[PDB]
Each structure stands twice: as C-alpha cells, then as structure tokens.
C-alpha cells in the first residue's frame, strides 16, 4: 500500500555492479533478488539524481522507485564549496518522492541513503508545494523513514526542511493574504508551537512612531495596509541574561516600487519581498524546535511599498531612529530604509552578533543569480561560520565586499547624511550594503542579500518551481553550531 | 536668489504648499510692513471656481493653497500693481502620466516659478521700491492615487474655458 524509495550508487571501477544502499540490498534480499534482476533487465545504470520505477515487487510496496545516489564516497567538493554526497541524496530522494506522488500514492517510505538527515531534506523539500488556493491539487504524500535506525537524523532533516518550507509558504502566499499583520500572526503561532520559552510582540504603528522609526514609517505610509514591527524572543540560554544573537529581516509584504514604480513584467514576484523576514523568522522557529541553548531575538519591520497621494516622494528627507537623515532619491530602494531603523533597534539588545537578510537588490541577482546568497560582513569569523554551515546544508553563501569605496558613493548626498541610492549604477548590492553599514556600529554584523535566491526554477533540484525560502537551513545550521561552539 | 534656492532645494516633505506659503509670508513681512499675505485655503480656491488648479491638487493628500502676496510700495494706493505669477508644484511625480524614476527627486524644485517670483517680491520690498506688486502662487503636489486627474478628463478653468 505504500511507495518505497531506495538508493543505488554509481558503479566504482573495482565493483562488478553498482551497489545498493543497505536498505536497497536488504529489500532485494526480501524479494529473492527480483529487484536486482529487474534493474538489470531495465537497461542502463542509474546515474546521480535519475530514477526508475518497478511495479509489483512486493505486496506491501506495489511501486518501488530506485534513485541514483552518485558516488558513495562523495564528500566535500572543494570546487563547489558543498558536501556533494548530501546534495546527491537530497536531489535523488526528491526525484523519487515526486515519482511516487505522480502515481497518486499517499504514503512513502524513504531509504536513509547513509545520511538520513539529507534524505529527509530531499523528501520534505522535494514534495512541498503551496497549493492552498487551488481546487486541483496533487495527492498529499506522507513521507517516513524506511527502517527504525536513523530516527534522530531523519527527524532533524524533517525539522530543517520544515523550517525552510515555512519560509517558502510565507514567501509564496499572495500579498493580499500575507499582510504585515497576517505574517506576524503566522510566525507567532509557529514560534509559540515550537517553545514556551518565547515572547512575541506585534508592535503597531503607535509603537513604531514612539520609537522614532521615521525611515521605516516613510515607506509604510504610501499604503493603506497597517505596518507592524515584529519582535520575537526565544529564551533558550540557561542564563537569562546571556546576550542574544539578533536577526533582522526586511518584511516588505509587497514592493510596487512606490512612486519610483516598477515595470509590470513579473512584478507579482514582489510578494516575496518579505523573504528576509521569512527566512530569519523561520530559522528562529526551527532553532526553538531544536531547543538550542541560546538566546535569540528576531526583528522584522513589515509594511507594503505602494504609490498613492501620501507615499514617499523622490528627494524627500527622512530621519532614522539614530538621528541620521536619509535622502530618498529612489522610493524602490525601500528595503534599506526600513532596515536602517531595525538595525538601529537591534543594537539596543547588546547582541553577540547581528545578522540581517533582505531581498534587497536587483544587482545581487545580476551578480550571482541563484548560485549563492551574497554575504557582506565586517567579521571574517562570522563569514567563516556562515560559509562552513553552508557547506553542510548545500544552500551556499558567497562573500561580497564592504569597502569604504562604496560608502563614499552613498554619503555623497545633496540634502542629507546618506543617499538611499548610489551616485552610479555600478555595484548596486555593494552600495546598498554600504548604506546599511552606516546604521551599524556592532563588530560582528552580516548582511545577506537574498534577492538572487528568492526563487527556484530548476537550479536546486529538490525545490519545485516557486519561492525558495533560501537560505533558511544555512541560518539554522549556523545557530546550531554556534550553540555548541 | 538664495531664498529661492533654499525654497527650491528643500525636500518636498518639508517644503509643502503650507510651509512654502509660511516661509514666504515671514520673509515678506520681515522686509516691509506695507505687505498683506493671504494663504488661501482649498475652500477659497473652490469659491474662486479654480477647477483646473483643483484638478491637479486632488490626487495628493497634501492640502493645496493659493498664495496671494501684496507689497504696497507706491505712494498712491490706487496705482495699478505689477502682477507676478509662479507655478508652485511642490513635488511633480507626473501623476497618472507618471514620470520615470531617474532623477525624479529634482521635481521637488517644481515650485521654482513660485520661489523666484516670491523671492523677487521680498527683495523688492527690502529695496523699498516705490511700486505696487502682487504675487500669486498656486501651490499643490502632483501625485497618482485613486482620486487623481485621469488622462482625457475635462476640467473647467476660472474663465469658463474647458
């Protein structure tokens, strides 16, 4: 009655035939060699990420999908900066699970493939689709570990993937549903389900005004949708006074550009302009689910960016919480405006680290596309921790420069202390990062521009087309390692 | 001239129709007591049937004003005045016929007509020139919204022309 996904490796030069995983070889034994026999008859060997489906092998598993895992011993690939074996497993298991789903089978058991966490990630990421609003849906598939030996690692993969899928849900949902208020309520319920050691404050416009967040308010005011400032606390440290790590996420729930209005083409993707808030909030939910013994604060200014008779006008000058004035030359450079105020507020926590994420610039997509999230940081220690985490998760990061060269192009400003768009078109992600740095005094800060990793087409084999929720798992892995130190 | 430069350079969220009128008022009054200033509100603009001006202002939530300034410098109070008129668009987004993003910030200076004529009148008063002068500056923003001018709309000017 269930489907079964089993792995096979590529044949090594010294082997007579490609080797099954332990689970594949055991299943083959159970069916008196019929799996190997039919795989032989079926023709060419299964290469990494490829699948083949065999029917009627066992009364309990009418459909068995064998998936190619590539080289058994594939480890860290220094030319790709990731663990290749884990990436092979995520892709192959995703492909196998999609095939089971296409056969309309509601239950699947999955070979741990020598790394149950990566297997669970492939299945759970691989099956995910946002289809709440559609009458016609694929069968809902319940994936479970095949066997009972690798359970903690399997559940850890489920938890990591579910954190990323939460971010994908939050990003994909249409903006008329995923308003600042709705986003805050969904993160609140998820965080509270994860741990009772949690406080959530959905701070209203009146509080934003009391906090003198003039830069954030200037963005929100064009729209009739109320802004909120989401503040989430996870109190995981055994010492309540232990300084927290602080995450900050850009939560623009829809970006029209405002008065500096965007072109029509593909503007619908701007419902995911709260991806920064989605990924940092989701990572914190997952950290709470993991019980990590650390204090964490999440901060997400949430609003829409819309044109109207009260919107930001090019040339307007606004005052950030820290008292710096900003000339708003381009109203579509709104993420740095809202982040200025959130980053300022971040310092009030005495944090150990400040990490922000934002779908910030088109220039980042032109620079590195969906190959890797761009990381700008004043701490090589912090860069290296994020980079090492990314190797394990496969959700890659790539360092980008914080140089005074770019700063000079944003503090050169006709009316104010800093200009919100550079003097030139060049290096847009770098001048955006330099603008943020004018609101940071902390010695361990990282800015992640995730505009290029906002969506997947087919680049990441285990994510279906749509909002990607990257790099949620790299953030979770970073927090997990930090908590062990 | 520097007064006009200040008025033009200031960001439009500070230099609103109301703020512009208040700054010109204080400068003119500091220049001479022989001065009247009327910061005419929307109700007066409507009473004056200025439908063409109102049609521009309505897209924005920023209140329009019609600034009227008198400098009574002639020894004869009945001497006909010279009249100056200045365009006071405090910010021009283009409205529904919206401008491109590039350098749109310079449109904070779309009240430069009002700035230069008002400033010249302030300076004339500072100079004690023996002439009667009236300055007129319709001031509003030009913004897109759910109540803005729509291409093809027909409006009626004060003189009755459509």
């Amino acid at each position: 009655t269930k489907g079964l996904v089993l792995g096979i490796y590529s044949k090594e030069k010294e082997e007579d035939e490609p080797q099954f995983t332990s689970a594949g070889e055991n299943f083959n034994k159970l069916v008196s060699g019929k799996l190997r026999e039919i795989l032989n008859i079926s023709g060419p060997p299964l290469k990494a990420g490829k699948t083949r489906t065999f029917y009627g092998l066992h009364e309990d598993f009418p459909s068995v999908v064998v998936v190619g895992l590539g080289k058994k011993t594939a480890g860290i690939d220094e030319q790709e900066n990731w663990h290749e074996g884990k990436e092979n497993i995520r892709a192959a298991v995703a492909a196998g699970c999609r095939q089971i789903q296409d056969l309309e089978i509601p239950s699947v058991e999955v070979d741990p493939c020598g790394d149950a966490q990566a297997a669970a990630e492939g299945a759970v990421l691989g099956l995910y689709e946002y289809d709440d609003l559609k009458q016609k849906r694929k069968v809902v598939v319940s994936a479970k570990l095949h066997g009972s030996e690798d359970q903690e690692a399997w559940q850890r993969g489920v938890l990591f993937a579910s954190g990323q899928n939460l971010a994908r849900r939050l990003m994909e949902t249409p903006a008329n549903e995923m308003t600042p208020t709705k986003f805050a309520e969904i993160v609140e319920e998820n965080l509270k389900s994860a741990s009772i050691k949690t406080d959530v404050f959905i701070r209203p416009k009146s509080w934003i005004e009391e906090q003198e967040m003039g830069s954030f308010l200037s963005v929100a005011k064009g729209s009739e949708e109320p802004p909120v400032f989401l503040e989430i606390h996870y109190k995981g440290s055994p010492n309540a006074s232990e300084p927290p790590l602080v995450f900050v996420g850009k939560g623009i729930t829809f970006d029209s550009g405002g008065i500096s209005i965007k072109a029509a083409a593909n503007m619908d993707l701007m419902r995911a302009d709260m991806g920064g808030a989605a990924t940092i909030c989701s990572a914190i939910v997952s950290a709470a689910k993991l019980d990590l013994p650390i204090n964490i604060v999440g901060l997400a200014p949430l609003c829409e960016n819309m044109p109207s008779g009260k919107a930001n006008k090019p040339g307007d000058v606004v005052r950030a919480r820290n008292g710096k004035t900003i000339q708003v030359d381009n109203t579509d450079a709104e993420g740095r405006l809202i982040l200025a105020d959130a980053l300022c507020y971040a310092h009030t926590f005495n944090p150990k680290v400040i990490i922000n994420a934002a779908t910030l610039t088109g220039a980042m997509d032109i620079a590195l596309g969906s190959g890797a999230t761009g990381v700008f940081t004043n701490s090589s220690w912090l860069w290296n921790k994020l980079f090492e985490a990314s190797i394990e998760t496969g959700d890659r990061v790539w360092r980008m420069p914080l140089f005074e060269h770019y700063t000079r192009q944003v503090i050169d400003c006709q009316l104010a202390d800093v200009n919100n768009i550079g003097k030139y078109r060049s290096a847009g992600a770098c001048t955006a990062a330099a603008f943020l740095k004018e609101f940071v005094t902390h010695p361990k800060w990282a800015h992640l521009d995730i505009a290029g990793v906002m969506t997947n087409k087919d680049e990441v084999p285990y994510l279906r087309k749509g909002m990607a929720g990257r790099p949620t798992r790299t953030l979770i892995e970073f927090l997990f390692r930090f908590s062990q130190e | 001239q520097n007064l006009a430069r200040r008025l033009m350079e200031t960001p439009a969220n500070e230099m609103t129709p109301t703020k512009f009128a208040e700054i010109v008022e204080e400068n003119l009054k500091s220049a001479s007591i022989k001065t009247d200033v009327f910061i005419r509100p929307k109700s007066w603009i409507e009473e004056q049937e200025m439908g063409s001006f109102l049609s521009v202002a309505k897209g924005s939530e920023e209140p329009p004003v019609f600034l009227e300034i008198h400098y009574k410098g002639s020894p004869n109070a009945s001497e006909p005045p010279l009249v100056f008129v200045g365009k006071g668009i405090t910010f021009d987004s283009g409205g529904i016929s919206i401008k491109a993003a590039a350098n749109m910030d310079l449109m904070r200076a779309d009240m430069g007509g009002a700035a230069t004529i008002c400033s010249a009148i302030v300076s004339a008063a500072k100079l004690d020139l023996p002439i009667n002068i009236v300055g007129l500056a319709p001031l509003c923003e030009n913004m897109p919204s759910g109540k803005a001018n729509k291409p093809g709309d027909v409006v009626r000017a004060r003189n009755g022309k459509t």
Partner: peptide, 4 residues
C-alpha cells in the same frame, strides 16, 4: 533597488 533597481540598476537603474
């Protein structure tokens, strides 16, 4: 932000 767009470029440009």
């Amino acid at each position: 932000a767009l470029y440009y």
